[PDB]
């Protein structure tokens, strides 16, 4: 019995083409170039899934020592002094948000400045 | 470059340029008015104007001058004894052109030139 490709190739192909969506030019309408684009897209995906966590670490750090310098401290100094004070163990995420609620971050700064004199 | 110009080459050599302007002067004189390409009309206007001014002199010299260009004897006769005398008190401007839109095949724009 013969068993020609029939329905199968078109269906895998459409699966890739639908992954394409807003890909510029042939990247979204010709199969081979869509497939190949998605190879490099795999690369980018997995590695960024890692990276985003370095990213938000960086951003919270920026904001935290921005607030720390608002009061005459700095990230090195404020983070250490908080660490010295019965280990606060707030995440760097959480210290930022208290850089959206200044009256508290202030007291955290005075507390870090304490366990440090 | 080209900062002084006698007219046009059309797309023809010295011999033809002449044979054309001659033939077309002959036809406009025989026929009162004719339509042709707007270009070839603008080129015709002064040749034929000067030709009628030559014939406007009457003497055998002017007729033989006209015979130099209008080699058909009846047109020369008409221009000599009919048309030029009519243009007696007209100081040039023996001729006019008006333009009549565009042709099908080459998409060129024709116009008419006629005696005034």
């Amino acid at each position: 019995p013969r068993a020609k490709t029939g329905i199968v190739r078109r269906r895998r192909h459409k699966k890739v083409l639908k992954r394409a969506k807003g890909f510029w030019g042939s990247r979204s309408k010709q199969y081979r170039n869509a497939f190949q684009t998605l190879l490099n897209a795999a690369t980018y995906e997995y590695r960024d899934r890692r990276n985003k966590k370095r990213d938000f670490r960086r951003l919270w750090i920026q904001r935290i020592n921005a607030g720390a310098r608002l009061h005459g401290m700095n990230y090195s100094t404020f983070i250490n002094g908080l660490k010295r004070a019965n280990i606060d163990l707030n995440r760097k995420v959480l210290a930022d948000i208290a850089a959206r609620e200044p009256e508290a971050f202030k007291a955290l700064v005075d507390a870090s400045r304490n366990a440090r004199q | 470059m080209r900062h002084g110009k006698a007219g046009r080459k059309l797309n023809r050599n010295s011999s033809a340029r002449v044979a054309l302007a001659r033939a077309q002067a002959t036809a406009l004189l025989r026929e009162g008015r004719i339509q042709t390409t707007l270009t070839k009309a603008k080129e015709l206007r002064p040749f034929v104007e000067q030709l009628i001014t030559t014939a406007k002199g009457g003497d055998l010299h002017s007729r033989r001058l006209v015979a130099q260009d209008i080699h058909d004897k009846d047109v020369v006769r008409k221009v000599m004894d009919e048309v030029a005398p009519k243009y007696a008190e007209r100081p040039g401007g023996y001729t006019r052109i008006l333009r009549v839109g565009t042709r099908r095949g080459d998409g060129v724009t024709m116009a008419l030139i006629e005696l005034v």
């Binding site: - | 333009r99 009549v100 839109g101 008419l112």
Partner: protein, 58 residues
């Protein structure tokens, strides 16, 4: 073959890029003052043949 030749096929985008300059100009048509049809300027109203007076047949 053909000494100069093109390198990559040109994009669907850049090809229509060049073409932004081929749109035709519509005639500045005007209403003929006697035949009540439309005519090109400084030419003779095709519909009635008129040009202030009337030069051409029909």
């Amino acid at each position: 073959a053909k000494h100069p030749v093109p390198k990559k096929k040109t994009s669907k985008s850049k090809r229509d890029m060049r073409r932004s300059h081929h749109a035709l100009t519509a005639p500045n048509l005007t209403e003929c003052p006697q035949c009540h049809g439309k005519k090109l300027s400084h030419h003779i109203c095709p519909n009635c043949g008129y040009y202030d007076g009337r030069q051409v047949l029909a």
